Ligand binder design. Structure first.
Ligand SMILES: COc1cc2cc(c1OC)OCC[C@@H](C)n1cc(nn1)CCCOC(=O)[C@@H]1CCCCN1C(=O)[C@H]2C1CCCCC1
Length: 128
């Protein structure tokens, strides 16, 4: 399903073109602006290890997930991927460990060398 679809069909949005972050737009957003470093960004997300174990979602907290883009508050892949999204867009990202939690991982939630999958909906973003 979704992770394999991104493997097969996703755009490589990395500067190095190492397939570290692959993206499919699932629902098109509105407007010309995309988030820039420093912006406060508001999202809903569903995430999981690509091996389907551990499913984490903002809905569990009954509240949007808010972060500042580029401020080291989220994994590199989010900084890269959310900067490509329009307001209202829903996208799927598939992420190699070098753009997430690497060889160390982040136990107990994230093992070493983990590939991650997210669905992200961009709700809003505001300038610092
Ligand atoms: C490695 O630790 C975790 C990883 C992830 C979630 C974690 C977490 O423990 C802190 O808590 C979820 C609760 C929520 C309100 N929240 C989100 C963050 N901190 N608290 C942000 C923490 C860092 O997360 C990220 O950079 C990414 C993108 C933003 C959304 C959360 N992310 C995760 O890596 C998830 C992880 C997704 C894959 C399945 C397991 C959880």
């Amino acid at each position: 399903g979704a992770p394999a679809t991104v493997t097969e069909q996703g755009e490589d949005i990395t500067s190095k073109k190492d397939r570290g972050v692959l993206k499919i737009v699932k629902r098109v957003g509105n407007g010309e602006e995309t988030p820039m470093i420093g912006d406060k960004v508001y999202v809903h997300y569903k995430g999981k290890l690509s091996n389907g174990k551990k499913f984490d979602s903002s809905h569990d907290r009954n509240e949007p997930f808010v972060f500042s883009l580029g401020k080291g508050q989220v994994i590199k892949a989010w900084d890269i991927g959310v900067a490509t999204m329009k307001k209202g867009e829903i996208a799927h990202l598939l992420i190699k460990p070098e753009y997430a939690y690497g060889s160390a991982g982040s136990l107990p939630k994230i093992p070493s060398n983990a590939t991650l999958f997210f669905e992200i909906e961009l709700l809003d973003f505001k300038g610092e």
